[PDB]
Amino acid sequence: DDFAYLNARVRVRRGTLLKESFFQEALDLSFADFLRLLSETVYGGELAGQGLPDVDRAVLRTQAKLVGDLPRLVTGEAREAVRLLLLRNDLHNLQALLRAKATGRPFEEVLLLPGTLREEVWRQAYEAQDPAGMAQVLAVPGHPLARALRAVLRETQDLARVEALLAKRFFEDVAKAAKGLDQPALRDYLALEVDAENLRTAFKLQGSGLAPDAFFLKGGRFVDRVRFARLMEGDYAVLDELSGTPFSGLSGVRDLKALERGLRCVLLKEAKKGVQDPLGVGLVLAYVKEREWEAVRLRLLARRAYFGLPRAQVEEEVVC
């Protein structure tokens, strides 16, 4: 692993990073003009659809070539970084397959995202009835965690553990275990991903009365045990108790839309730290992550341009 060597060779593709100044031209086009903006470069010959499956093809064919296959393009530690992304896509296709699989929908109606398992793995993963088949499919590519999930699915498939054991259990250890890399920026970024998963779950259930002080999961970056519980109780005072971290200024903040806007900005700023890193995924991390957050907002703006949505009517939700 590392990317600094491919980076200087890849910066040739970074010539297509578009920041706010791109998005400002796009918000003002008719749906046909938006189609031109993208067509005025190399992407113009890959756009050819209107719904999710159409936008996906434009993102898929490109992302497939720069991200989807990246695990084969790096070695050592860097290979683990991209390799983890694909393993997370196995969760997409599994969650999506489990929900349909429960009743016998054909495979031809499911979308598969490129991940750690070959396209033919999913076609077989679905095909296996017992947890060995589902797990063996995950392990055929020598995946050391696939073999671990085998023992769990052989013994338990209840929906709560599956939803968690795949990630919870895979990310519970992975998250804090991941600190075993020499990636000072990633160590901080991952901790924030855990904080968000705990916060999103805690926020969503707020107002019930739970005593989360037993179920707290360490591994984050700035979120504490009794605050995590209090916040889930609806006492927003947790947002006023964060002195001593980057989130302290939130003291008094009140509302998810503003939180989520704040969190997205933190994760982007953390990805930016790697621009001058000599070793490790620092600069590449910024490349993949900026491509994500860029894709999220690009695909959405295509829709605003086509249907003619107000720009400031909805930007609060899509900014940090």
Curated annotation (Swiss-Prot):
It holds the Pfam family vATP-synt_AC39. The keyword Disulfide bond does not apply. GO terms for molecular function: ATP binding; proton-transporting ATP synthase activity, rotational mechanism; proton-transporting ATPase activity, rotational mechanism. One of its GO terms (biological process) is proton motive force-driven plasma membrane ATP synthesis. SUPFAM superfamilies: V-type ATP synthase subunit C (SSF103486). One of its GO terms (cellular component) is proton-transporting V-type ATPase, V0 domain. Keywords: ATP synthesis, Hydrogen ion transport, Ion transport, Transport. The keyword Phosphoprotein does not apply. InterPro entries: ATPase_csu/dsu_sf, ATPase_V0-cplx_csu, ATPase_V0-cplx_csu/dsu, V-ATPase_V0D/AC39_subunit, V-type_ATPase_csu/dsu, V-type_ATPase_csu/dsu_dom_3. Produces ATP from ADP in the presence of a proton gradient across the membrane. Belongs to the V-ATPase V0D/AC39 subunit family. This is V-type ATP synthase subunit C. It comes from Thermus thermophilus (strain ATCC 27634 / DSM 579 / HB8). The gene is atpC.
